């Protein structure tokens, strides 16, 4: 097979270097052994039969932040990854990942919950259990379907596959049988009344998920040509139109200091709608009209002119008014920023409250009280995760001694650059000393009581033992958590075992031999 | 076919509880399950989106940032001067000290990069005058004035690149 490995890798680059327009980001390991290289598309005639099996390049309007992550996902995601792209991926590693998926999917079915409930903590609607959902079952039982939508130059992970299962984010069907429908608008699921309401022809259609469904004459006549015949559909009774389009609102989220809601029920010009165009009952249309006629008078909302997004900004304290400017939101899949208004930025107030710690020692934290790296902490620290700080404090104190042994004047710098927690108002005289005093340092180990010296020492002694118990491999992971003062990884514990290694590996590799996995272990 | 026994034996027919139909008694069950588990391990983090006929439903798991620095005040406190020509008064307060202290700082950085590398600055220029003026004298301090007093057009023809 060693000969075959070369026959693959030699022909592999032939496939890449012909098909990758971006090889430099793929394999930047060598730059001078080749020019800067790209690949270029060219117009072509098409056979009237063979191209039927092709698919479209796009079905949607794509923004710039997606295009980069899509081309990056197309080519470079796997080339830089450890496991490698799905193309040249071995059967064994694909098979290993496939077990861990199955081990996770059944835990979700073991709950009996639904799709939307797991994701959402205040769901509007609730769909199916997952024992009945065909898609989730189709993914669980067939491994190849997991790989179809995953692009060839992409990595084969667990998280990406479970996304499809717990959310069917698939778009239209880009067969050459489907009809490209233009108007596809997607409103939020709180503007809806009954789900049985008639189908908005202007808005998004369920038929686009499969071209075989939108392969009817009406769809082809719509996009490809103009109409000549007016075809009449049965209308609805004035009662049935309303009954479908009834909305219901919390009575407590009616107050005049929330314009995100109240402006939904006024025209563009600034005139109140009827209940019908508002999709409401009688009393809920009263309780809003009072608030408009009152909010008009507190000048949040206009009397007669056009509604403005500044008016649509609901009222609240300075923080939620200020933070929402300061709050820049970033995907963790993709480093780009969401522009304001382009995303629902989320916060459970009740959960943050209940997520706090019911156990707290304010005295134990008086040492680290003035010390803070971040602006403020929304966390109420435990006893354990407090010890981590006092050891961080001890550490920075040790290096001051390390530098002072080499001659550095420690007191000289701490007068110029140390930043107090309490900063007065900024003026022309205060801003230069304080902008130099940005840094936050611990106190001297010398100017202390023994118990204050003991805790910083004992705290350092605890975590020094844990990292000895923790293996060496996951050096960085401790350093990620060491900043944010998370102590879970630091909490490791291995238990005793009387079994010999030969009995172990002979037993484990036997097990794995059944599922495949001819490759034994080596420890 | 498509049928097993263990699903039948592990099954146990029972009677319906309040959970199956009644929301409040059901939602009390759901919260007891989500406490132990964390969705982000199963799905990473993403725009948690689900789409009905034409209706979406979102609860993304993002990373929030709040960048703050004391210099960002810009001395712009609200003092009735939001608009009117009283506004532009609020800008021209430090419009003198702010200019001057800036011009101080290019001359720091420019000079430090020129002092530290006068030699290459002297050497790289002379190599170019030779190709233009081969086998002749090269008065640096005199010819250096021709590196500057030239217009943007003439500077290109001799030196091959343009700056001012």
């Amino acid at each position: 097979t060693s000969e075959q490995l070369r026959i693959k890798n030699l022909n592999a680059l032939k496939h890449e270097l012909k098909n990758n327009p971006l090889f430099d980001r793929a394999f930047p390991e060598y730059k001078g052994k080749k020019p800067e290289t790209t690949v270029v598309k060219k117009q072509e005639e098409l056979d009237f039969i063979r191209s039927l099996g092709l698919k479209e390049r796009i079905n949607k309007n794509i923004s710039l932040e997606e295009a980069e992550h899509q081309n990056f996902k197309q080519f470079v995601e796997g080339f830089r990854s450890p496991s490698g792209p799905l193309k040249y991926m071995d059967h064994e590693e694909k098979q290993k990942i496939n077990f861990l998926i199955d081990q996770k999917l059944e835990e979700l079915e073991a709950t009996g919950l639904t799709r939307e409930e797991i994701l959402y903590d205040n769901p509007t609607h609730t769909g199916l259990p997952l024992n009945q959902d065909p898609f989730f079952q189709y993914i669980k039982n067939n491994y190849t379907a997991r790989e179809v939508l995953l692009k060839p130059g992409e990595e084969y992970t667990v998280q990406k596959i479970i996304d499809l299962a717990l959310r069917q984010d698939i778009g239209a069907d880009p067969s050459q049988s489907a009809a490209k429908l233009k108007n596809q608008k997607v409103y939020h699921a709180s503007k809806m009344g009954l789900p049985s309401s008639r189908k908005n022809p202007n808005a998004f259609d369920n038929t686009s998920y499969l071209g075989a469904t939108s392969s009817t004459s009406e769809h082809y006549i719509k996009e490809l040509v103009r109409p000549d015949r007016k075809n009449h559909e049965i209308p609805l009774t004035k009662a049935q139109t309303r009954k479908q389009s009834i909305r219901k609102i919390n009575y407590f989220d009616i107050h005049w200091r929330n314009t995100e809601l109240i402006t939904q029920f006024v025209n563009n010009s600034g005139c109140i709608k009827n209940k019908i165009q508002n999709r409401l009952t009688r009393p809920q249309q009263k309780k809003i009209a009072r608030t408009i006629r009152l909010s008009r008078e507190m000048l949040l909302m206009p009397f007669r002119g056009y509604i403005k997004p500044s008016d649509k900004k609901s009222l609240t304290t300075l923080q939620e008014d200020v933070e929402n400017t300061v709050r820049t939101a970033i995907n963790i899949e993709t480093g780009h920023i969401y522009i304001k208004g382009s995303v629902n930025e989320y916060r459970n107030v009740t959960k943050e409250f209940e997520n706090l710690n019911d156990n707290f020692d304010a005295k134990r934290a008086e040492q680290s009280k003035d010390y803070v790296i971040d602006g403020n902490s929304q966390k109420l620290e435990t006893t354990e995760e407090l010890t981590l700080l006092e050891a961080r404090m001890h550490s920075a104190q040790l290096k001051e001694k390390q530098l002072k042994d080499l001659g550095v004047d420690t007191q000289a710098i701490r007068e110029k650059y140390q930043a107090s927690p309490k900063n007065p108002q900024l003026t022309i005289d205060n801003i230069l000393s304080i902008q130099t005093k940005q840094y936050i340092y611990p106190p001297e180990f010398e100017q202390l009581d023994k118990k204050n010296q003991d805790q910083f020492k004992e705290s350092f002694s605890k975590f020094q033992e844990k990292i000895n118990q923790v293996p060496v491999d996951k050096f960085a992971s401790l350093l990620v958590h060491e900043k944010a003062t998370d102590a879970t990884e630091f909490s490791n514990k291995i238990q005793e075992s009387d079994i010999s290694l030969q009995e172990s590996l002979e037993y484990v590799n036997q097990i794995r031999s059944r599922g495949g996995l001819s490759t034994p272990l080596k420890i | 076919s498509s049928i097993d026994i263990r699903k039948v034996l592990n099954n146990k027919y029972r009677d319906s509880e309040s959970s199956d139909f009644y929301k409040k008694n059901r939602e009390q069950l759901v919260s007891r399950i989500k406490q132990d588990m964390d969705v982000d391990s199963y799905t990473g983090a993403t725009t948690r989106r689900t789409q009905f006929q034409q209706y979406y439903q979102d609860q993304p798991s993002l990373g929030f940032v709040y960048p703050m620095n004391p210099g960002r005040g810009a001395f712009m406190e609200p003092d009735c001067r939001f608009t009117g020509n009283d506004f532009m008064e609020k800008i021209n307060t430090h419009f003198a000290t702010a200019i001057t202290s800036s011009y101080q700082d290019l001359d720091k950085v420019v000079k430090i990069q020129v002092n530290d590398s006068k030699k290459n600055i002297e050497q790289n220029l002379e190599k170019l005058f030779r190709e233009k003026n081969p086998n002749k004298e090269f008065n640096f301090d005199k010819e250096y004035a021709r590196y500057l007093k030239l217009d943007s057009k003439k500077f290109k023809k001799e030196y091959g690149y343009e700056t001012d």
Binding site: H188, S190, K248, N250, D253, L261, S314 | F21, Y22
Partner: peptide, 28 residues
């Protein structure tokens, strides 16, 4: 809030009865 919806707890999740299915598959 921009998206408000009232919890209609009187509504029941599971229908206690059967119905002719609306959108079947095949003709069984």
């Amino acid at each position: 809030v921009r998206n408000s919806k009232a919890a209609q707890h009187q509504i029941r999740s599971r229908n206690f009865f059967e119905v002719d299915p609306i959108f079947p598959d095949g003709k069984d």
